[PDB]
């Protein structure tokens with residue numbers, strides 16, 4: 001048994017994006033985000049920015065709606081917006097290098113009332129639904145079709161369901177209410193031995209073809225052949241129990257496992273353990289979305305990139321993280337691979353659970369290479385600076401989606417998490433974050449020999 005009462009619709013091929021199917025997918029995208037945002041009990045909590053590097057929650061309540069409107073205006077499927085001031089106020093978010101830069105940016109913003117932003121959402125929903133009902137869906141949809149703006153808006157909303165869930169997780173438990181049917185994975189369980197598996201080397205082609213019949217973001221496209229040498233990777237994501245051993249061996253107290261930049265981050269934030277653990281009465285509790293529970297020892301540990309690399313430092317002996325090409329080889333092999341959307345059901349993706357799961361519990365989630373949960377459970381960090389593939393081109397609808405972040409200051413992560421939905425659960429999505437940032441994200445370890 002797994003989570004069932006809250007359901008996320010699978011993504012749809014562009015050749016099957018009929019008006020009726022898209023109506024259902026749109027309604028589901030929006031209702032899911034509504035369920036998440038309604039879990040905040042008190043409206044005053046929307047003026048908190050629980051992550052010090054992101055905007056207050058009120059911004060994210062409006063932003064998904066404003067983005068749909070702004071892109072539909074840009075392709076001229078909408079002749080006017082709903083509230084021009086809000087379309088500007090909620091237009092774009094933030095990716096600051098530090099909390100002081102963000103604090104300076106948000107210091108003098110007059111935010112609307114929570115009820116006014118909910119009213120904006122409800123009006124936007126009805127305006128977009130009417131656009132859908134009054135537009136011909138001439139199959140197939142594609143990147144030069146006006147309806148690309150709608151496809152982009154729905155994936156953007158599902159991405160913000162995921163990133164907003166990480167903000168609500170940073171609120172105190174007394175400030176949020178678990179939605180009916182939210183179901184965590186089973187949590188008792190000591191981890192099994194995490195064996196190193198030889199991944200046979202081969203050649204991969206990274207990227208996505210322009211006429212592939214699936215919505216994707218600009219940075220997904222291009223074509224890059226990479227020869228990948230054989231390498232060893234741990235069959236499981238590193239677990240909470242494995243990371244607890246690192247803590248007990250003074251992992252956060254030993255400079256040689258860190259570097260000057262990551263140690264500085266650790267000291268500045270007085271970090272002694274992963275973000276969502278707390279030590280009390282001699283033992284660690286763990287913060288799931290809405291509840292504190294005993295630390296689930298066999299779940300994948302959730303860390304930022306700095307902490308993943310510090311664990312690699314403790315392992316020593318050339319222990320490292322995979323590259324993007326190495327993850328692709330392990331997850332999809334060397335094959336014109338035809339995505340099968342139904343396979344999303346085989347991994348802890350798309351709200352199969354409302355939490356990470358024990359490594360290996362989902363019995364269909366072993367890739368052919370032998371590695372477990374390459375797809376799903378938690379994103380996994382990669383030692384790969386976010387970068388374009390040959391053939392990359394920004395899209396007119398969102399020219400700065402990815403180009404600003406090809407800056408050697410963002411590391412990549414791939415594969416999707418329990419909370420990931422839409423085309424972000426499939427092969428081509430490329431994800432990236434500053435290395436100090438927290439997501440529903442872990443890692444596995446690699447050695448060359």
Ligand SMILES: C[N+](C)(C)[C@@H](Cc1cnc[nH]1)C(=O)O
Pocket residue numbers: 093095156159160163430431432433
């Ligand atoms: C690709 N990530 C997940 C890093 C992006 C997704 C995104 C949201 N709005 C525009 N892009 C981010 O969170 O900034």
Ligand SMILES: [Mn+2]
Pocket residue numbers: 063067093156160
């Ligand atoms: Mn956004």
Ligand code: NA
Pocket residue numbers: 373374375376377378379380414415416
């Ligand atoms: Na994964």
